[PDB]
Prior knowledge:
DhaK_1 (chains A, B), 6-stranded mixed beta sheet, Rossmann fold, 8 helices, 16 strands, protein homodimerization activity (chains A, B), homodimer, 30% strand, Hypothetical Protein Tm841, Chain: A,domain 3
Amino acid sequence: DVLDEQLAGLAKAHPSLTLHQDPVYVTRADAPVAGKVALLSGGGSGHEPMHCGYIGQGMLSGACPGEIFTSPTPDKIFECAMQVDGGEGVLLIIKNYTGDILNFETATELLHDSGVKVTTVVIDDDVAVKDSLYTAGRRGVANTVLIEKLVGAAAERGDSLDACAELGRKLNNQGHSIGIALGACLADNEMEFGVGIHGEPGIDRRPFSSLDQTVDEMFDTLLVNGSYHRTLRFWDYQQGSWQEEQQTKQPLQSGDRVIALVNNLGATPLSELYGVYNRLTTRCQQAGLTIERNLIGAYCTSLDMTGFSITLLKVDDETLALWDAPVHTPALNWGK
Amino acid sequence: DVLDEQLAGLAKAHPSLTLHQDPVYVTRADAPVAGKVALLSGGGSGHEPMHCGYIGQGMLSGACPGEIFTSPTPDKIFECAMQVDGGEGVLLIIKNYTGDILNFETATELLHDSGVKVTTVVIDDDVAVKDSLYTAGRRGVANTVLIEKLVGAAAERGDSLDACAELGRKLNNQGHSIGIALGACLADNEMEFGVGIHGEPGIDRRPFSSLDQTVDEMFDTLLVNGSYHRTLRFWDYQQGSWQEEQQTKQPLQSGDRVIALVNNLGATPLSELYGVYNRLTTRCQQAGLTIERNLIGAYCTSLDMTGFSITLLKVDDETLALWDAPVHTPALNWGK
C-alpha cells in the first residue's frame, strides 16, 4: 500500500513523531504530555503537510490521516485522542466537510462516554461557496493551519481547554480564505476560481489573464464575501450534548491587522508565490490592512494541483504573541 | 517585469533580507557582518528557494539571482560581494555550468583586482551526465544546498576563509546526486532519467513503472557512478591566479554515514517524497549506509518540473555538528 509507505517514510524521517498501527494515527513521541491541553486534528491524506507536519511542541499533539481526500474513521480519532490526553482535556479541530464533521463528532461522543473531557472547533474559512457538494456551509481550508499554530501556542502556554476552544472559535470568525486552480490534482488558460482542496468546484471557471489580475480578483472576493452568519455546533462536555451556536464573521476592514498565508495548493513554483505576495501587500496597503506576519509556501495542499490560496486572518497584539511563540514541527519551526 | 515583482515579494516577506537595485542582488539585512567570512552564491532564477531562501544566519551572506535559468552577470556578483565583505574574505560557491563558472570567475578576478580576498568552491555533484549541454564535467545540483548549510555553519562560528574553502571542496567530493523528471518545467508513462535542473537531457528516457522502482534505479546509479577524477579550478588569492586542482571522489560504500536530501524539483507532492524517502532508507540499510539526518522538501527546484532528486552526502561527527548548528533563513530554520 502506497499510503503505508508514505506514512512509514514520515515516521522514519521524523523521530519526534510516533506512527501507531491498529489503528493508524500519528502523535508526538513525547505524548501524552501531562498537564497541558492536547490538540488534535486530521482529515484526508493528500493535503500534506496538513496535518501530520504540524505535530510537535507548540502545535498539534497528534493527527489522524485518512485515505486520500477522505476523513479518518472514528476509531482513529478516538484512539489518537486517548493516546495524547494529558489529563487537561483534548481539543478537536475539525475542517467543515460532511465526512470530517460526521467522523470527528462521532469520535467526540465516544471520547466523552469514555470519560475524556473534550470539545471542538469547526473551521469554515473558505469564502468562495456556501453549500459545496461535500460541505454544509463554508469549507475548511488553509486558515486551519494558522489556527492550529495559534491555539497550539495557547495550549503549550498552559491555557485551559475552554480558553483554547474559545480562542479557536474566535480566530475562526476572523480568518478568510480563497483558492484558485489552473489545473486539477478544463480549457487551457482557464482557471477554477474558488476551488476546494479536494477538487470541489468553485464559483466558476474564468480566464487566467495574469498573476496580478488573479490576485486582485481573489483579494476583492476576500473583502466582499467576509460577512457571514451561520450555526456551528460544538460539544458541551458539561451537558454531554451538541450545542448549536450562532457564529458571526465581520468583513475584513480598513484598520485591521492581519497574518497572511500565501499557500501552494501543489504545483505552483515558489517564485510565483512571492509574486502573489507582492501584489497582495500592495492591495492590503491600499485597503488599509496591515500585514503583520506572513507564511509563504506549501502548507495545505491538494495533491499536485496547480494553484494557490490566500488566507488573511485578523489579529491583535495577544494573537501576535501566540504567533511568535515557539513551534517545533516538521513543517513549521521557530524559537523564542 | 515578473522577476522584479517576485524579488520585491521576497523582500517584503522577509525583513531579515535586503534587496538591492542597480545592480540587483539580495543580502542579509545585517550585512556586512564584521570579522566573519562572507558566503555567497547565485545562479538562474527558477530554482527557488535556491539560493535566496538560504540567506541568513548560519548560511549565505547574500545571493545573486539571474534571469530564468541564466547566471547573474559579473557586476551583480561583484557588488554583492563588496556589500557583504566583513574583512575576512568572501567565499563564492559556484554550481558547475558554463555560464555560472564564467560569470563567477570573472567576478572573482574583479574582486581580487579591487583588493578583496576571495576564493571559490565549485559544485559538481550530479552523477548522471559528464559534459552535458551547458557544463564541462558534471552538473552542480542539490548538494549545493547541503554545502551552503555546512560551510555556512563553519563561517558563522568564525572559521577562516581557507578552512571554509577546504571544507566546501571536501564536502563537494563526498556528495552525490541524481534527478528524474516525468514532465518538463516526453512520451506517456516515460521519465527523463538523470535530468538536469535547467531541463538538460539526462542519461536516457525510460518507462516509469513505479515510484519504488524509480528510486531503486536512482539509488543504484548513485552507487555505481560515484568514482570520479577531474580538475576543478580555484582562485589562489595569494598568487592572484586560477589553480588547476585534481579532485577525487570515492563511490559511496558500506560503512558510510550520510545526510540524505530528497528534493522536489517542482510539482511532486510531499506525500510522494515521503514514499521516496521510505524506499531510500531501505536501500541505504541494505547497502550498509547509515542515514544520520535528512531534508525532505522543495530545496533546489526547476520551475514547476514534475520530478525529484536524491542527494547523499557522506559525513562524519564534525560535519554532523555543523549540520546541527543554528541556521535562520527563509527556507531552513533550526536552533540548538
